[PDB]
Structure formats: structure tokens, C-alpha cells
Design a protein around this ligand. Structure first.
Ligand SMILES: COc1cc2cc(c1OC)OCCCn1cc(nn1)CCCOC(=O)[C@@H]1CCCCN1C(=O)[C@H]2C1CCCCC1
Length: 128
């Protein structure tokens, strides 16, 4: 499936080069600009545990998910990944636990040492 493709084709976008955040661009976006720390970011996403026991979709709320980049309002993998994205871009992220919810997890929803997958569309970003 899409997660395996990211394991095999995904770019390692971590500073440490520890394969903790792997990325495939699925649809190229527009312009050269990628968001800066502090920017207000608008996305649609679908997310799952790599074992697919818990699926989540902004589409199920029919409304963008909105967050300020780089403030740790979201897991570290999103601060890293969405920062690399162009407006209009769709990307797949595969995320080791270190960059998601870790050894502790987020029970009962997310188990210890969980690998996460997302598809993310960057709708827009704007300055603080
Ligand atoms: C650990 O708790 C949740 C995790 C996840 C989704 C959650 C969580 O319940 C709070 O609610 C879905 C309802 C909408 N929504 C998203 C958020 N808050 N409310 C951001 C919460 C923080 O989430 C994250 O940092 C990441 C990135 C942004 C999208 C959501 N993320 C998740 O980890 C998802 C999780 C749900 C299970 C499948 C894997 C993704």
C-alpha cells in the first residue's frame, strides 16, 4: 500500500537523517514558497496507524484543519513535513514514533511506539 511505497521511495526529510519522517510528493504544488515558522497553515488530511486500526480525516468534518507551523501544536513530523510543502501540494508522510507519539503513545487512541501515515494537502498558508 501507500505506506510501503513511502518506506521504499520516500525522501528522508529529517535533519538527523534517521528516516523518522519520510515523504513522497503525490501532487506538485504552485510557486516556490513554503511556509515559515509561525505561519497559519490550512490543510486537508487523512491519517492512520500504520496497522490501520484508527483512521482520521479532516474531510469527515468537511472543513480545513488549521494550525500555526512550528509551534509544536501538532506532532513534530507535521512541523517538519508541512514546512517542506508548496501551496496546492499533496504529500504522503510516514512517521516513526519518535516524531509522533513516542514510547508513551496517546492512549487509548494511539498505542506506544506507533508508526503513523498521512496524506496531506496544503490548501494555503499566511503570515502571523
Ligand atoms: C492524539 O490525539 C489526536 C490525534 C489525531 C487526531 C485527533 C486527536 O484527538 C485530539 O483528533 C481528530 C479530531 C480533529 N482534531 C485533530 C486535532 N485535534 N482535533 C489535532 C490533534 C493533534 O494531532 C496531531 O498532531 C496529528 C497531526 C494533525 C492531524 C491529527 N494528528 C494525529 O495524530 C491524529 C491521529 C488519529 C489516529 C490516526 C492517526 C492520526
Amino acid at each position: 500500500g501507500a505506506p510501503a511505497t513511502v518506506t521504499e521511495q520516500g525522501e528522508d526529510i529529517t535533519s538527523k537523517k534517521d528516516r523518522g519522517v519520510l515523504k513522497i510528493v503525490k501532487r506538485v504544488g504552485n510557486g516556490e514558497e513554503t511556509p515559515m515558522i509561525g505561519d497559519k497553515v490550512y490543510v486537508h488530511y487523512k491519517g492512520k496507524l500504520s496497522n490501520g486500526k484508527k483512521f482520521d480525516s479532516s474531510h469527515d468534518r468537511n472543513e480545513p484543519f488549521v494550525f500555526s507551523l512550528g509551534k509544536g501544536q501538532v506532532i513534530k513530523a507535521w512541523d517538519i513535513g508541512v514546512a517542506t510543502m508548496k501551496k496546492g501540494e499533496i504529500a504522503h508522510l510516514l512517521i516513526k514514533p519518535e516524531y509522533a507519539y513516542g514510547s508513551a503513545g496517546s492512549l487509548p487512541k494511539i498505542p506506544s511506539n506507533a508508526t503513523l501515515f498521512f496524506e496531506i494537502e496544503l490548501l494555503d498558508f499566511k503570515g502571523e
